[PDB]
Paper text:
Three MICAL isoforms (MICAL-1, -2, and -3) have been identified in vertebrates. RP/EBs5 as well as MICALs contain a single type-2 CH domain. F-actin, leading to destabilization and disruption of actin filaments. the oxidation of Met 44 of actin by MICAL.
of the structure of a MICAL fragment containing the entire MO and CH domains. 0.25 and 0.30 using data to 2.31 Å resolution. one single chain monomer per asymmetric unit. used for crystallization MICALMO-CH is a monomer in solution. domain and residues 506–554 and 562–614 of the CH domain. the 19-residue linker that connects the MO and CH domains. is compatible with a flexible linker between the two domains. greater for MICALMO-CH than that for the isolated MO domain. MICALMO-CH, is found in the kinetics of oxidation of actin. significantly increase the efficiency of actin modification by MICAL.
Numbering used by the authors: 8 to 487, 507 to 554, 560 to 614
The structure:
Amino acid sequence: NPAHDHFETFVQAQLCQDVLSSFQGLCRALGVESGGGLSQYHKIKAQLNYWSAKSLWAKLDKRASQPVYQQGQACTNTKCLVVGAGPCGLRAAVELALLGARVVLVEKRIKFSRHNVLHLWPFTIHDLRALGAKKFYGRFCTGTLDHISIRQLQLLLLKVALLLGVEIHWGVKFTGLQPPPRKGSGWRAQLQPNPPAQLASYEFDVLISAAGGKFVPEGFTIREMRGKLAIGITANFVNGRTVEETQVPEISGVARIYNQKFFQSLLKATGIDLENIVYYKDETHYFVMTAKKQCLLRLGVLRQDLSETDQLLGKANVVPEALQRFARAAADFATHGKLGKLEFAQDARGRPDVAAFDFTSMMRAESSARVQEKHGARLLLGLVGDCLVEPFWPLGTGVARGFLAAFDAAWMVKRWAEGAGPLEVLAERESLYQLLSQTSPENMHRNVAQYGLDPATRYPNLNLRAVTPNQVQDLYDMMDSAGTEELLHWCQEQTAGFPGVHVTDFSSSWADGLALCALVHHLQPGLLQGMGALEATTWALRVAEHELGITPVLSAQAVMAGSDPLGLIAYLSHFHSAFKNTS
Ligand SMILES: Cc1cc2nc3c(=O)[nH]c(=O)nc-3n(C[C@H](O)[C@H](O)[C@H](O)COP(=O)(O)OP(=O)(O)OC[C@H]3O[C@@H](n4cnc5c(N)ncnc54)[C@H](O)[C@@H]3O)c2cc1C
Ligand SMILES: [Cl-]
């Protein structure tokens, strides 16, 4: 039987190319075209009615039938480009596809090559337990196992995303946005190496960027923040799965709070000074440690004391042989030798798998979402995963906060598909974003099994109006109400003839306060240089109030920052209302 011979190969595939190989071999044996969407998910399960595999269809159909998605129609008029086939990219891709949306994902690499091990919060375990991971990965969180290697997380999620009919492409980097030439024309992706001509023509109205710690799309800004110099070191050793190795208790890291006698012993015993060390028993014996610069220099792990941290941990300044020595001795002391002699696993390049990372930064994007609109054509952009907020690896928030963000973005595209105003969608979304960087299992909802896209199911005492529509206008970039153009033409008419006033808009035009003075001076002749925009703005607001009867809608600061156009429009409307030509 050809059918689910393929399907068993597909399920147990450990290599990206083979998952891909298998699926399109399963598809051919079924008359199903790969790239989906749900319609092709349907014909797959409806033509493969074999035991052991039904367990999986039950799990997926269980999630697929829960009200939020309705029945894959919530987002049928929604077309997405998802960037990044990382875990958060795939996890979000699955939600979009379950929502019924057309999901096309682009990934720059062609293999899952990372072997570092991620901590999984209890809810993510449930979440992907119920996506059928146990079947795609036998060792998935067996017993009290709390973690999963990056590439295994990807092998799972890929298989789920493929099944659900996500059109995925490999070996193609999203470079930027190629905007609409004209109404009716949509947004497209700039891709490279320049894609096939149908991907090239693919027009979308939602972009979800899950591209990892170093790539955010245009217009998204990054708030950088740096703590004390902090050097992270990960390492993977061959885990032979002998009974002896299997008994070595793993090290959680929370012991740095409860146990510092250890770090003293480590230091005395090896000359190694760590701030923390973590050990997970996974496909490899995984260690991540945090080290003091002084310590790494003294041990010849780093060649020279370099001030620019990116050059401090550049290839030229990291001594491979000494780093290996360093990691080996630390791993060995911490597990008291019970792992036997440690042999480095290979990384994907084929090197002893040990690397140093900058752990100093606390990056967050300023917002989780924005909306661009040109020639009436709207594009919702949503951040997910490491690119949104950077995880502190020793504390294991990466998967969980990436997943929370992926649910919040799918929830966002649901509002977007309901027809909500861009400001409303953004405000709601930024209200959720606010909570992300302080989430813990402890301050979240207790019942992880009842978790769904609805943020209420996840965040206790949820305030969906923490950020208001007025506070996210700079997130809505309208670079393309007919009463606004009346107001504008009228405002321009009033302030005409003033040296260095040129009313052009309802933000930057009015920022230095001279526009306001002109308006007032014009409206009441005979009242009253180089004081700042602050004094100009202020006089105008006081004089408007007392002479013209119009109280301030915006503060002076808000006039100068120009980030509240709607409120300036409402201010100005009072002047026009008060002094319209006639009735
Ligand atoms: C080398 C490396 C080692 C790590 N080690 C640990 C660890 O030890 N412990 C821990 O807790 N976390 C670790 N992390 C972070 C962890 O991998 C992520 O939190 C987790 O995978 C979820 O992140 P993500 O999907 O948002 O981003 P990522 O995992 O970075 O995935 C981003 C995806 O986007 C692809 N991509 C990037 N740019 C583009 C582009 N322009 N166009 C198209 N595709 C693009 C990338 O190839 C990648 O596949 C590591 C990350 C990296 C990159
Ligand atoms: Cl692979």
